[PDB]
Design a protein around this ligand. Structure first.
Ligand SMILES: C[C@H](c1ccccc1)[C@H](C[C@H](O)CN1CCN(Cc2cccnc2)C[C@H]1C(=O)NC(C)(C)C)C(=O)N[C@H]1c2ccccc2C[C@H]1O
Lengths: 99, 99
C-alpha cells in the first residue's frame, strides 16, 4: 500500500500470536518493541537515540507479520516509548520512500 | 525519486544557505537539526526520543530545501547526533512510504 505522512505511519503487527500496533520508522536502524514476553534466548544489548542509550533484550530470527507481509529477523525488546519497525524489517517487506 | 532502506536514507538539504546531510525519518513527528546559529526569534522546547528528552530551540517558518524540493516550516535546533527531517516537512514534499 501507499502511506501518506499527515499522520503517524502506524500499522498492525502480529508477533507470537499477539496483535500490536507499530510505527514504520525509517530513521531507526533496528526494531524495538515495548517490554513483552518472547520465546527463545535473548542477549543483552544497548541502543542509542535522541535522549540517550537504553538497555534492551535481543531476540534473533523472530517471525513477525507486518500489515500482512511476513518477515523474520532481529527484534529488540525494552523500555521504548513506542513500538518501532526499523530498517532491518522494512527492507524485508520491500519498503521504500517515494516523492 | 525512490529510496531504498538498505542504508540510512540520507539526503542533502539546504538551510540558511548551508548544505547539510539529513536523515529522512518517517518516525519523527518534528524536524531536528544539529546545533547551529540561525537568526531570528525562537521558543524553548523539550522533545523526547528513545532514551529521554533533550532541550531544543524552536524556529518557525524556516525555508528549507530537500533534494531540490522547496519547503518551509518549523525546525528544532539542539544537540542531536544527526540531522532529522520529520513528517512536518516530509508531507510538504509529497513523500510517501510504499510496499
Ligand atoms: C534521529 C534518531 C537517530 C539517533 C542516532 C543515530 C541515528 C538516528 C532516530 C529517531 C527515530 O527514528 C524516531 N523516534 C522513534 C521513537 N520515538 C519515541 C518517542 C519518545 C518520546 C515521545 N514520543 C515518542 C521518538 C522518535 C524521535 O526520535 N523523534 C524526534 C522528534 C525527537 C526526532 C533513532 O532513535 N534511531 C536509533 C534507533 C531506534 C530504534 C531502534 C534502533 C535504533 C538505533 C538508531 O538508529
Amino acid at each position: 500500500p501507499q502511506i501518506t505522512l499527515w499522520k503517524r505511519p502506524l500499522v498492525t503487527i502480529r508477533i507470537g500470536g499477539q496483535l500490536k500496533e507499530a510505527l514504520l520508522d525509517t530513521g531507526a536502524d533496528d526494531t524495538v518493541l515495548e517490554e513483552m514476553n518472547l520465546p527463545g534466548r535473548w542477549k543483552p544489548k544497548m541502543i542509542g537515540g535522541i535522549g540517550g542509550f537504553i538497555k534492551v533484550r535481543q531476540y534473533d530470527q523472530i517471525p513477525i507479520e507486518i500489515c500482512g507481509h511476513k518477515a523474520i529477523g532481529t527484534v529488540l525488546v525494552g523500555p521504548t516509548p513506542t513500538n518501532v519497525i526499523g530498517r532491518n524489517l522494512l527492507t524485508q517487506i520491500g519498503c521504500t520512500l517515494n516523492f
